[PDB]
Design a protein around this nucleic acid. Structure first.
Ligand code: ZN
Ligand code: ZN
Lengths: 542, 689, 265
DNA sequence: AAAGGTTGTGGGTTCGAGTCCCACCAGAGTCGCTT
DNA sequence: AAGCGACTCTGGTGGGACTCGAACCCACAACCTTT
């Protein structure tokens, strides 16, 4: 890319927040591919004239001086063991130069983040004539305004810098989705991690960031990778890396580069077998690193656990072997769509059909099938039962001919009555007290039984394990999440059907979270919870 | 032969208007759509290894303000509109309230600001060497658009605005004695003043010789306005005339230019087709240019008035093998049929033959394209059939033989809203949409542009070797087929290499050296951009060698013109002695013609140095190397690849491929280098802009 | 074979009306639930597309610039389904809700001579409605219910397939006294209709044997006040709307008789 | 004796569902001016 | 008075966007788990 365009591109790769003059030189000096000129003081005046004479660039005075940029370099890019680790090595999270303040619903359609967008004033006509002749030298401009001078490229230039030449300018994005893309852009070759965007850039639910990121993936403006953060804990964290397509580079990983070497080694060894120790010794690896590689190769399905006698390799020795529904409805001329939809639902009968499965069967839009379901419910001809499958609490719809006799009805009615029994049987180191569907009522009832039969239960894991086995005996393929249980236990706490007691006990230099759950009939002073604390501290003792 | 090319292009907005896809001589594809014109620019990218079509995307925005055709005073028209809308006659009142020409915007009417039609000019019409885009909205705003910088289209002129004023200044009379100033308060005269300036369709002429181009605009009442533009077109300043000819054709549907040559005599006319069926060529009786001349009397191509609307017209120059003379073939889409007519000047004057090629489609033809080099016709209908239709010469006139191309086999069940063909017939571009799925309607509609290969690589390679036009940019669509093969197979196919070496040996014109440079640069990209490192160094050495050859030939031609015009003793705009030194620098090339030329120049050159100075220093630039100049302070200035002057200006020109750079001409430059600076890029023949 | 075809709708085009006052214009509605007005000189873009509920039939009464629409109820908000007049767009009025209906209106017919409209429902009711002069803004029509009346309603009276329904039910046709509309809003057929509107629930466990499928006013000046209708029963019924027949129709019938008898003999 | 597959954990990903809330609608009410 | 045509004032629903609840996934330490 040409030097003069690389300048204007760098001005446009910052967002609507723009650049200070010292930031611009810092951006050019840190550019990849390298900036062609030496950026001498005379050159800085030449480039300043190239900005002032360009009609798309515009200049503002902001109410307060901006901070200077940090060394942005995100990654370690070294190791003392074989290879190198390019995991994120955290700089100090100093005060962000570019805090997110989205320009919502703009009548001119310009978009981005700018904390001063309503407060800064244009000084274009002070820096240049309307004939685009520059009125100030760079040194005069920086003397007069300093960091308060802010350079911004036109929206057309900024959006182009995000989509490249192959990208389509006609595509409008939601302001939040654009501000994600703009937040990627200013990161250049080292994209923002999705973790960090929702945690500290946008400060939102991970669901919100994912949802708004969807459109950027759908139109293909960004590239997705898994990436690794090396914490000061020494443990290392998985997170998503977002790279704007211009800046995409396929990032490798220590375990990836080392598993390739093991794959090359085992695939070039004509047996595809070696003992773990030699697989380590040929790479100089420690067992702590290598056991990850072994289990990754196994979990990738590339290899199999094998053991052979030493006389078979030439005492048993551990080795690795490498090895690698509803039919569509024909709409009739002669009946209305409500009649025809009811005819469908009766054909399904006792099992019912979902709104999404109706939609596909009826060949209608999402909003159209929604109105069909709404009307038939309001007409009282069809009845709706919630059913949890996968991640989704769908509704299944059954006609009132079969609804009462449906399994969904019968199972739900049993668990409702069983719940009414189990509720009405209720009686009339430093502990802290915390603040419908068939399967959901089953899980509620099972916990209420447990706290009724065992007035204390020692951990949320014990609750989960019995629930997991109970659902597995029923044959449920999904596996119950910890958060689902603890949110469920929170619901029962607000209904007052149990207490959950939490603390950390400390013993022999180690600490354990306790998370006792007890029947409401006892408070944290009861000898039973004290006995539970003691017997936990006992088994935690060295 | 027909297979899909990899990138489908997504469109954000509904495809809109008449015959909505076109492919310019400049390899920009425009689709007219409800909110923009999307322009797809095909680049033979030499900087990346990706096998897809490298499509750069730009768009013309739809206008923000609705267009009112001027029919009277602002108050006089307002009282008339009230009169008609309030009329108690159902016919007058509903004719006013339904017809959108009288009602371009309203309280509950959707604005018609999307595009009705688009036409691409010939090359060389823009201020750069490029073509202009004529764009017509559905509210009858006709505009001329250009992309002067790469990023943004700008409107150069609105022709409806000018024509409305020029009609108003003549009280809507073309001949001032011929009609009264009829009262606007009469619905027939009211309708007429709208009808007489509502554009249907428009087409550009070829380049008339100073260059000029005509634009003919067809109006609903059968008037045609022939605009004349001076070139390069820069706005209202370049509009040399507007003249209106009364075709008299009722309900004219479509227009095309006829231009033809026999015995080196130029002739031309306008061919016009009615929505009610007939087709006629008008003599263009009025024009100002002296080199052209015009047909003497109208000829009727189809007379029947069968009410099959003439939806499209195309024509192609041919040479008839048996009549042993040049002839023009006209093809016109008429309902579901293709009408064809062959026009042949002879001693009898025009000899004319016509027929309908029949059985092509079971629905009306929605678009048509002509392969200008062969007369191959393509035709399309919304059932997704596309039919290739080959003209076969007959001892007199023609026969047409045709075959379906199964888009089903490449895209599945699909609707096709338009087709276009690349200037060399390399690709067919198709506006595809979701088709009927086993008789069900698709739930959601999403327009796309998709491309299919019309030619094999071997035919594209052969046609480039035997190319009569001998400019790569005229043939980007063929060298893209060659490019795709090289990137796919990571080697240059041997027969192409051998044949190209034979051409370079036997002819050696710089076109073949440019073709070699293309193959080698695409080869370098193919092999992942230490035997691979040794191979990379080898072929990069070959690129540098042929790149150096093309440089010497251009430098020789530049000095081979400095010698011809009056000696620029002030050395004003060419580093003449530096170029002479650079050419003499090696004895490796024996060309005595250069070595004596630099002899004659160096004999004639001044002993005064007149050196080039670095503007950041006022210190000399030595002229060490082709690409760039440097000074002791370390500044680096690119050199103009057309004149080797250093591009020290804050704005300078860049090749379409960014392979080369050029300086802007200045008033101090003599005419001959102001002409030299209009040359295409010496390495890639692309516009340097 | 056709001279012209164009892809009017993205889904089955269920109904057409061609403009009487100027035949350059046509309207169509399709099961994409758009009403599209067309200029047949310029078919590439409709004059106006209005997205609406799914519609079964259209009527274009000569004197009014817009079209009156009969809906299939499957996408309308409950209590807002029925029959709407929709201006083609220059006057810019909102849609005029001429009649609420619970069921789908299967068929619609505008009498040009009467300026009234008649509509048949799967409820088995036939209503008629008088439109206001739609050159004038409908929002002033502060109580549209005074402008509509039932012609008849068919009830099944006990006595999924035809024989099982016919063996166990009969059709009670209840006919309005169309002789005059005095005290209309207090007469039992209007109360019966008004208790039908909004509140009544559609029946889906039967053949719909009462449903009315076509309605047609006479286009002829002779019999201009007559209507015919028929439905799933295969019965076809004829009615004279005596209250809308009028002295001007008699005046015009006799003068037209005289002119006709002079022209043909 | 003498040690590794097997598992639970804090947090992020993501997938399709139902929910939101604003604009619009249909009806009834207000009342300045007219009749 | 009785009447009219804007101008409101009042309950109800859907359109697209978006909160919601769930399982699914990383990589680690814990150690149960094995000859
Ligand atoms: Zn210098
Ligand atoms: Zn070039």
């Amino acid at each position: 890319m040409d030097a003069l365009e690389s300048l204007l591109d760098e001005v446009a790769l910052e967002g609507l927040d723009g650049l200070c003059l010292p930031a611009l030189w810092s951006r050019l000096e840190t550019r990849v591919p390298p900036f062609p000129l030496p950026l001498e003081p005379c050159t800085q005046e030449f480039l300043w004239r190239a900005l002032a004479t360009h009609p798309g660039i515009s200049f503002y005075e902001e109410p307060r001086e901006r901070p200077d940029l940090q060394l942005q370099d995100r990654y370690e890019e070294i190791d003392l063991e074989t290879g190198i680790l390019e995991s994120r090595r955290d700089p100090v999270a100093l005060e962000d130069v570019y805090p997110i303040h989205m320009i919502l619903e703009n009548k001119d359609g310009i978009q981005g983040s700018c904390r001063y967008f309503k407060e800064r004033k244009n000084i274009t006509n002070d820096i240049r004539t309307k004939s685009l002749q520059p009125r100030c030298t760079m040194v005069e401009a920086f003397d007069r305004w300093g960091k308060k001078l802010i350079i911004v490229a036109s929206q057309a230039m900024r959006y182009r810098a995000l989509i490249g030449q192959e990208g389509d300018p006609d595509l409008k994005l939601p302001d939040f989705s654009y501000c994600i893309l703009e937040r990627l852009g200013r990161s250049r070759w080292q994209g923002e991690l999705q973790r960090d965007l929702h945690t500290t850039a946008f400060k939102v639910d991970a669901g919100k960031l994912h949802y708004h990121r969807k459109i950027l993936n759908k139109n293909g403006l960004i590239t997705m990778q898994s990436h690794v953060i090396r914490l000061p804990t020494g443990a290392q964290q998985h997170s998503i890396l977002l790279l704007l397509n211009r800046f995409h580079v396929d990032r490798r990983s220590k375990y990836d580069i080392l598993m390739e070497k093991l794959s090359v080694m085992l695939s070039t060894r004509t047996n595809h077998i070696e003992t773990l120790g030699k697989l380590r010794e040929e790479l100089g690896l420690c067992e702590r690193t290598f056991k990850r590689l072994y289990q990754y190769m196994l979990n990738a399905g590339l290899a199999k656990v094998v053991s052979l006698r030493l006389q078979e390799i030439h005492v048993m020795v551990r080795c690795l072997k490498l090895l690698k529904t509803v039919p569509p409805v024909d709409i009739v001329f002669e009946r209305d769509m409500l009649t025809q939809t009811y005819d469908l639902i009766e054909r399904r009968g006792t099992k019912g059909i979902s709104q999404a499965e109706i939609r596909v069967a009826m060949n209608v839009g999402k909003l159209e099938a929604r109105m069909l379901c709404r009307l038939l419910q309001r007409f009282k001809v069809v009845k709706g039962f919630m059913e949890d499958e996968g991640r989704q609490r769908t509704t299944k719809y059954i006609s009132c001919v079969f609804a009462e006799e449906s399994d969904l009805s019968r199972q739900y009615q049993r668990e409702k009555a069983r719940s009414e029994l189990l509720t009405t049987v209720s009686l009339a180191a430093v502990i802290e007290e915390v603040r419908e569907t068939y399967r959901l009522l089953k899980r509620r009832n099972l916990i209420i039984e447990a706290v009724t039969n065992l007035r204390l239960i020692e951990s949320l894991f014990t609750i989960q394990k019995m629930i997991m086995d109970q659902e597995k005996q029923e044959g449920v393929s999904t596996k119950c999440c910890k958060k689902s249980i603890v949110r469920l236990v929170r619901n029962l706490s607000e209904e007052g059907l149990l207490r959950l007691y939490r603390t950390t006990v400390i013993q022999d230099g180690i600490k354990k979270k306790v998370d006792l759950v007890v029947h409401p009939s006892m408070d944290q002073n009861d000898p039973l919870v004290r006995s539970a604390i003691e017997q936990v501290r006992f088994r935690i003792s060295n | 032969m027909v297979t899909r090319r990899e990138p489908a292009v997504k469109l954000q907005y509904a495809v809109s208007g008449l015959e909505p896809l076109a492919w310019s001589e400049d390899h920009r594809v425009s689709v007219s759509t409800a909110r923009s014109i999307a322009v797809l620019e095909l680049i033979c990218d030499v900087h990346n290894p990706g096998q897809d079509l490298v499509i750069h995307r730009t768009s013309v925005p739809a206008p923000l303000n609705s267009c009112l055709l001027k029919v009277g005073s602002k108050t006089e028209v307002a009282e008339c509109k009230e009169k008609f809308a309030a009329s108690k006659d159902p016919t007058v009142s509903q004719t006013f309230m339904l017809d959108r020409v009288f009602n371009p915007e309203g309280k509950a009417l959707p604005p018609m600001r999307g595009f009705k039609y688009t036409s691409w000019s010939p090359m060389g019409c823009d201020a750069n060497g490029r073509c202009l885009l004529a764009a017509l909205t559905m509210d009858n705003r006709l505009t001329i658009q250009a992309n002067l910088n790469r990023l943004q289209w700008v409107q150069l002129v609105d022709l409806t605005e000018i024509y409305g004023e020029r009609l108003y200044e003549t009280s809507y009379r073309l001949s001032k004695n011929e009609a009264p100033e009829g009262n606007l308060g009469d619905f027939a005269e009211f309708q007429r003043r709208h009808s007489m300036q509502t554009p249907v369709r428009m087409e550009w002429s070829g380049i008339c010789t100073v260059g000029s181009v005509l634009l003919a605009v067809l109006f609903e009442n059968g008037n045609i306005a022939v605009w004349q533009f001076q070139l390069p077109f820069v706005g209202k300043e370049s509009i040399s005339s507007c003249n209106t000819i009364e075709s008299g054709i009722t309900s004219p549907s479509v227009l095309f230019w006829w231009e033809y040559e026999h015995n080196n005599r130029k002739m031309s006319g306008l061919i016009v087709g009615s929505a009610f069926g007939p087709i006629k060529i008008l003599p263009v009786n009025l024009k100002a240019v002296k080199g052209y001349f015009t047909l003497r009397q109208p000829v009727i191509l189809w007379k029947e008035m069968d009410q099959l609307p003439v939806h499209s017209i195309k024509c192609v120059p041919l040479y008839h093998p048996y009549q042993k003379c040049s002839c023009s073939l006209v093809v016109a889409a008429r309902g579901s049929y293709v009408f064809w007519c062959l026009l042949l000047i002879s001693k009898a004057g025009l000899n004319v033959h016509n027929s309908h090629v029949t059985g092509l489609h079971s629905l009306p033809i929605v678009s048509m394209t002509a392969d200008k080099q062969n007369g191959t016709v393509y035709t399309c209908s919304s059932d997704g059939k596309v039919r290739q239709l080959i003209p076969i010469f007959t001892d007199v006139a023609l026969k047409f033989e045709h075959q379906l191309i199964k888009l089903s086999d490449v895209f599945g069940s699909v609707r096709t809203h338009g087709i276009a063909v690349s200037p060399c017939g390399a690709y067919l571009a198709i506006i595809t949409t979701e088709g009927m799925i086993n008789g069900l309607h698709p739930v959601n509609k999403n327009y796309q542009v998709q491309f299919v290969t019309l030619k094999t690589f071997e035919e594209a390679a052969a046609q480039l070797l035997e190319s009569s036009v001998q400019n790569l940019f005229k043939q980007v669509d063929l060298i893209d087929l060659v490019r795709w093969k090289i990137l796919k197979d990571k080697h240059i196919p041997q027969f192409l290499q051998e044949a190209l070496e034979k051409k370079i040996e036997s002819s050696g014109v710089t076109y073949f050296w440019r073709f070699k440079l293309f193959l080698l640069r695409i080869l370098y990209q193919s092999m992942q951009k230490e035997p691979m490192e040794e191979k990379l160094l080898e072929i990069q050495g070959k690129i540098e060698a042929v790149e150096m050859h093309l440089t010497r030939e251009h430098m020789k031609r530049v000095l081979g013109e400095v010698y011809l015009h009056t000696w620029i003793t002030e050395n004003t705009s060419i580093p003449t002695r530096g170029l002479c030194n650079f050419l003499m620098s090696d004895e490796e090339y024996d060309d005595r013609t250069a070595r004596v030329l630099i002899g004659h120049i160096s004999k004639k050159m001044n002993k005064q140095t007149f050196p080039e100075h670095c503007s950041l220093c006022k210190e000399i630039l030595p002229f060490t190397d082709r690409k760039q100049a440097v000074c002791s302070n370390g500044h680096i200035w690119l050199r103009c690849f057309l004149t080797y002057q250093s591009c020290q200006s804050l704005i300078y020109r860049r090749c379409l491929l960014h392979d080369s750079i050029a300086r802007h001409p200045a008033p101090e430059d003599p005419d001959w280098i102001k002409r030299l600076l209009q040359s295409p890029c010496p390495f890639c023949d692309s516009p340097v802009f | 074979y056709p001279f012209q075809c164009f892809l009017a709708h993205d889904q089955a085009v269920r109904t057409l009306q061609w403009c009487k006052a100027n035949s350059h214009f046509l309207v169509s509605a399709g099961s994409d639930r758009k009403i599209k007005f067309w200029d047949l000189r310029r078919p590439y873009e409709p004059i106006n597309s209005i997205k609406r509920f799914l519609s079964t039939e259209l009527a274009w009464l000569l004197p009014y610039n817009g079209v009156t629409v009969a809906q299939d109820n499957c996408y309308a908000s409950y209590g807002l389904c029925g029959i709407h007049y929709i201006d083609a767009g220059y006057l810019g009025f909102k849609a005029y809700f001429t009649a609420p209906r619970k069921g789908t209106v299967w068929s619609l017919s505008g009498s040009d001579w009467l300026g009234t409209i008649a509509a048949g429902d799967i409820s088995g009711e036939l209503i008629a409605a008088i439109l206001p002069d739609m050159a004038l803004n409908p929002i002033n029509v502060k109580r549209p219910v005074e402008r509509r009346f039932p012609i008849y309603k068919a009830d099944l009276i006990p006595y999924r397939t035809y024989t099982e329904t016919v063996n166990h039910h009969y059709l009670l046709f209840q006919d309005t006294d169309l002789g005059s509309f005095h005290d209309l809003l207090r007469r039992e057929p209007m109360l019966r209709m008004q208790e039908g509107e909004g509140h009544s629930q559609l029946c889906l466990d039967r053949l719909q044997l009462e449903a009315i499928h076509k309605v047609r006013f006479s286009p002829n000046l002779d019999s201009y006040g007559w209507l015919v209708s028929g439905g799933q029963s295969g019965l076809v019924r004829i009615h004279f709307v005596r209250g809308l027949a009028s002295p001007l129709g008699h005046r015009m019938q006799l003068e037209s008789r005289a002119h006709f008898n002079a022209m043909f003999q």
